Amino acid sequence: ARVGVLGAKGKVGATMVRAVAAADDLTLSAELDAGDPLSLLTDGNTEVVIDFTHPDVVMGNLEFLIDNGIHAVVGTTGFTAERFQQVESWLVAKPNTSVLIAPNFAIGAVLSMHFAKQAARFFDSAEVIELHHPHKADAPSGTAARTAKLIAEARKGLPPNPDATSTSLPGARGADVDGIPVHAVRLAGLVAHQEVLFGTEGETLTIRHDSLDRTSFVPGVLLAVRRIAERPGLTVGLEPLLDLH
Amino acid sequence: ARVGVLGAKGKVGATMVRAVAAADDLTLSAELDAGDPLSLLTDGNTEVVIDFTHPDVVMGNLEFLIDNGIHAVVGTTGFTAERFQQVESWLVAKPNTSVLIAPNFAIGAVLSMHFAKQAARFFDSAEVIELHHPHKADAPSGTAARTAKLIAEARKGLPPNPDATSTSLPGARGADVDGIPVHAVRLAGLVAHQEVLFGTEGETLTIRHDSLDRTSFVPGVLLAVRRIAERPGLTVGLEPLLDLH
Amino acid sequence: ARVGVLGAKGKVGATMVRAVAAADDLTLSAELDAGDPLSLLTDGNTEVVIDFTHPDVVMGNLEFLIDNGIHAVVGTTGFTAERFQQVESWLVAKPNTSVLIAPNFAIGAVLSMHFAKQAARFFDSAEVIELHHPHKADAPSGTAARTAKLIAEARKGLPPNPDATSTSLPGARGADVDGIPVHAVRLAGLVAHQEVLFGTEGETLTIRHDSLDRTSFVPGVLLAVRRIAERPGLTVGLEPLLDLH
Amino acid sequence: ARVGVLGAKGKVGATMVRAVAAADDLTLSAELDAGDPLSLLTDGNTEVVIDFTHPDVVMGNLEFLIDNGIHAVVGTTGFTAERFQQVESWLVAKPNTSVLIAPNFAIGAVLSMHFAKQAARFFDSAEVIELHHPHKADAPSGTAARTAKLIAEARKGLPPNPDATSTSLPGARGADVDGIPVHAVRLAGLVAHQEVLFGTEGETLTIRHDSLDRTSFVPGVLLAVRRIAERPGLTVGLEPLLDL
Numbered sequence A, B, C: 001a002r003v004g005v006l007g008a009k010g011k012v013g014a015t016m017v018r019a020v021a022a023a024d025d026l027t028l029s030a031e032l033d034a035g036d037p038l039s040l041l042t043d044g045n046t047e048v049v050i051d052f053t054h055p056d057v058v059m060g061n062l063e064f065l066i067d068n069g070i071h072a073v074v075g076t077t078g079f080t081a082e083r084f085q086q087v088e089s090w091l092v093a094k095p096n097t098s099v100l101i102a103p104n105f106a107i108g109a110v111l112s113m114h115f116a117k118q119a120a121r122f123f124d125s126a127e128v129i130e131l132h133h134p135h136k137a138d139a140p141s142g143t144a145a146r147t148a149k150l151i152a153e154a155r156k157g158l159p160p161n162p163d164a165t166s167t168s169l170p171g172a173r174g175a176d177v178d179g180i181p182v183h184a185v186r187l188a189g190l191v192a193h194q195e196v197l198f199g200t201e202g203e204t205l206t207i208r209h210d211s212l213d214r215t216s217f218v219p220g221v222l223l224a225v226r227r228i229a230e231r232p233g234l235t236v237g238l239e240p241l242l243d244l245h
Numbered sequence D: 001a002r003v004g005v006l007g008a009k010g011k012v013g014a015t016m017v018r019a020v021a022a023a024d025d026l027t028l029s030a031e032l033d034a035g036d037p038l039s040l041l042t043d044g045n046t047e048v049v050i051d052f053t054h055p056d057v058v059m060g061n062l063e064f065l066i067d068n069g070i071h072a073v074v075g076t077t078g079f080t081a082e083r084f085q086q087v088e089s090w091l092v093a094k095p096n097t098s099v100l101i102a103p104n105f106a107i108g109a110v111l112s113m114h115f116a117k118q119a120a121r122f123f124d125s126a127e128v129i130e131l132h133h134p135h136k137a138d139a140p141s142g143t144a145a146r147t148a149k150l151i152a153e154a155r156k157g158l159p160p161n162p163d164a165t166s167t168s169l170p171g172a173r174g175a176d177v178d179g180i181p182v183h184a185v186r187l188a189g190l191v192a193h194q195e196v197l198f199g200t201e202g203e204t205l206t207i208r209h210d211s212l213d214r215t216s217f218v219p220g221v222l223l224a225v226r227r228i229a230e231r232p233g234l235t236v237g238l239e240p241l242l243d244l
């Protein structure tokens, strides 16, 4: 269909600009960034809008698109429970337009997390290794900390990871994130990588997600665009569309 | 429950004897091997049997178990549609008896197959690498062939793997199973290993199962023993006991 | 040193221009591409040239550089015995000029092949897996085939890889390159990757090289540039600069 | 050769006894453990000894062996610069006798450490990840610590590993061993595994060693046994025998 992009020259936005044109099914209509009026959406006959902007502006963006007709695929972060009620509330009176908000539009990332969550229950041990370029400020990554927290929740009815360590050097066993060891590698030549390691007597199971650039998000978002016409109202996360949960 | 083991002295059977013994909720009631009469099962008031014997004997074992109303958890392989049908005929006469037959009792293997199936529609490319000890007679393994067939079925209606190969040495691109390349490594020091690879521009996802030892089969078997009576009649596979939906 | 680039607008050549400019022991003194007079090098008082052009232009360039006493670091491919002998012939007249020609300037790639060669004899089994983006025409890659032949040469007089394969689908066991299986994965989202697997009972050894960028060729070329005057005549390969003995 | 095992009831020693028995070219001549007199070696006309005993007994063992012109392949650890010099001094009396002492007899481990040292010079980043079964007492492993130290030494005169980390949880970045991150994974289902990661913008290089059981040391020990008399006196490490 006919696609618009908000935050159209930002890191993710500029990437989504090139991707829509490169698609056969999809035609570019509106590319709005900072300082731009939202009229250019109605003036471009847009069917579907992608939003990768900023927490401080996104709420104003949505109030518009709903009161209009254009579907909204939102990647922009900073969301609370009271914030979704506002989106749902605008959609109560307007039951024809569909909206989706996702904290992660990378399909492989969403699949990894889901598999980790399903697998957690069945193994004695779980650890996370994440590996990034050496310009990363935060250790571990947001994704690894979140994965660890989720696996730990999936494991709340099981004993802790077995570990006879009785002598160690500080830091050897990783960050302890809700009882899950998370290790963080920072290596020139790498980009963004995460392995989830499960183990039990006689077998191991490993899940690896590798992102080599900011196009890891593209198929996820384009999936959510090609498919936003299907389900009405608000949908949170990419997982419903992946026939997962 | 009172549990007997058929094939009690075998490689897997001896493992199961030990686990049934060590399991506090299960009472080991019989250990039968070659030349032991099946009457030993009933003398022990066996309620459930684990069978890890040989395709040549399992049908006669199963006939006795079913006739006597003893639940059966069968790891023994060689089961065909005809054998499954025969099992179901026998169970008609014993509506309260349950039989669970699984071709793969490693939970990590079953999970990894499930995950491959769930991921398969959401990437451009999919291949399987399997790696085994150099005494393996079949290439690719049953499991890899099964995995590639599942992945292909999952991807029905979607474009084939992209591949510009125009010059190749015979065999480089692996075995073709329904359009899914399967590569088989035979290496001293390995046991049984399989990696499923998924990719699209900007990201890859990998699921690696490593099978090191036969103790890996224990949780799968014991889960089936504990849950056996939940489904009267024949259940094929471990998947349903894993509650993945 | 005063360094020029032949093929400065090219995929690898522009990467090299940037490299020379950024390094502050080297002065970028010439950036020639198609249609540029070679006189530009002399009018730049160029001491060393990095050549990443085309097999069709390189000997001509080389003849110029050698006649003009300009040291040459050549990445351009298509070099045969006859071409090396011609270069040898030109350097007889110019004994204080050095030419280094390498088919692979990626230090990581060079090292991995050297390691594979050193390891090959001490293991019962050796296999090569290579994985590339799906726009690659040739399977296996030149590097993989070449790595498999080095491994085979090193393993002369040892038993073949053990392999009890009695039933297989064609292609499952990979391409046989001098007795060494080579498996070629073609997966969207990959670039250039190679894994060499060694195994004997009780241990395995894996060497994995991942090539993400053309900047992978940068350190090899710059090392060659910094060390080219240290060896008269013709050096073939990057290996001799890495001081691997 | 007639080969005796000192420490024949031990984890590794018993593995060596089996290996020497199954080896077509070698004749098992003695099996000694604690409380067996060393004269059983001379009684069996032992020509070479494999020693996987204990740091407290090994020098006495060596003294006896050198005195009796019996070659020694020694895996027992605890050797010091001082202990090497003692063995070398004893060897002046018996220029006829060869001793080989190695901290690691798994050829694949010795190869990976060699590869790591070589590669360490050529990349911006180096890290070590090791992965063991969850009954392991020490983190990181002896091998992983040894490796990180050798990688550090190779990288003297290079800038440190780049790393912009400005916010971390404690432990996320591993143990710092001489400037080399070392991460210790402890996981049920695993045995003993180590990965060495090197990288520079553009490319990475990884070397992975996986030990599957105690038989990982066998070929290295047997090779040492076979080649021991090539080099008179004391050889430290297996590396020389791998004709690198």
Ligand SMILES: NC(=O)C1=CN([C@@H]2O[C@H](COP(=O)(O)OP(=O)(O)OC[C@H]3O[C@@H](n4cnc5c(N)ncnc54)[C@H](O)[C@@H]3O)[C@@H](O)[C@H]2O)C=CC1
Pocket (backbone or CB within 6 Å): A006, A007, A008, A009, A010, A011, A012, A013, A032, A033, A034, A035, A036, A052, A053, A054, A055, A057, A074, A075, A076, A077, A078, A102, A103, A104, A105, A106, A217
């Ligand atoms: N869900 C996911 O998979 C992902 C979500 N994100 C999130 O997306 C958001 C944006 O992504 P980045 O490219 O990292 O940020 P960015 O700072 O690079 O891009 C933001 C862009 O939005 C524009 N913008 C600001 N106010 C606007 C307004 N009222 N109307 C239209 N455009 C406006 C800016 O000019 C800028 O070009 C961030 O909050 C980030 O956390 C980022 C990556 C993935």
Ligand SMILES: NC(=O)C1=CN([C@@H]2O[C@H](COP(=O)(O)OP(=O)(O)OC[C@H]3O[C@@H](n4cnc5c(N)ncnc54)[C@H](O)[C@@H]3O)[C@@H](O)[C@H]2O)C=CC1
Pocket (backbone or CB within 6 Å): B006, B007, B008, B009, B010, B011, B012, B013, B032, B033, B034, B035, B036, B052, B053, B054, B055, B057, B074, B075, B076, B077, B078, B102, B103, B104, B105, B106, B217
């Ligand atoms: N489904 C799964 O996850 C797995 C299935 N298997 C299968 O299980 C079976 C057994 O495997 P292994 O333990 O490796 O073989 P095994 O040959 O070592 O064990 C079989 C045992 O059954 C005994 N046996 C033969 N006839 C008998 C009879 N009439 N009554 C009682 N015992 C009898 C044998 O003497 C032997 O002790 C094979 O078919 C194998 O393929 C093995 C591993 C996993």
Ligand SMILES: NC(=O)C1=CN([C@@H]2O[C@H](COP(=O)(O)OP(=O)(O)OC[C@H]3O[C@@H](n4cnc5c(N)ncnc54)[C@H](O)[C@@H]3O)[C@@H](O)[C@H]2O)C=CC1
Pocket (backbone or CB within 6 Å): C006, C007, C008, C009, C010, C011, C012, C013, C032, C033, C034, C035, C036, C052, C053, C054, C055, C057, C074, C075, C076, C077, C078, C102, C103, C104, C105, C106, C217
């Ligand atoms: N040894 C190594 O590690 C590597 C070698 N190569 C080889 O290097 C060569 C170039 O590689 P790419 O950059 O991919 O090719 P490219 O086609 O992208 O660039 C070649 C450049 O050379 C220019 N050129 C043609 N004739 C010229 C002349 N007479 N004087 C100056 N410039 C001229 C072209 O206009 C073009 O800009 C190829 O032969 C390729 O196989 C590529 C990668 C690595």
Ligand SMILES: NC(=O)C1=CN([C@@H]2O[C@H](COP(=O)(O)OP(=O)(O)OC[C@H]3O[C@@H](n4cnc5c(N)ncnc54)[C@H](O)[C@@H]3O)[C@@H](O)[C@H]2O)C=CC1
Pocket (backbone or CB within 6 Å): D006, D007, D008, D009, D010, D011, D012, D013, D032, D033, D034, D035, D036, D051, D052, D053, D054, D055, D057, D074, D075, D076, D077, D078, D102, D103, D104, D105, D106, D217
């Ligand atoms: N270089 C290498 O690759 C390896 C070296 N080692 C080292 O080798 C030594 C033995 O290792 P493990 O088998 O794990 O220990 P272990 O404790 O299982 O074996 C030591 C054996 O030596 C015996 N012993 C003690 N005094 C003796 C004597 N005077 N004569 C003959 N036997 C005697 C003990 O009873 C025991 O059977 C240790 O120093 C260990 O650190 C262990 C593994 C690998």
Ligand SMILES: [Mg+2]
Pocket (backbone or CB within 6 Å): B020, B021, B022, B023, B024, B025, B026, B027, B028
């Ligand atoms: Mg019990």
Ligand SMILES: [Mg+2]
Pocket (backbone or CB within 6 Å): C020, C021, C022, C023, C024, C025, C026, C027, C028
């Ligand atoms: Mg410069």
Ligand SMILES: [Mg+2]
Pocket (backbone or CB within 6 Å): D020, D021, D022, D023, D024, D025, D026, D027, D028
């Ligand atoms: Mg023998």
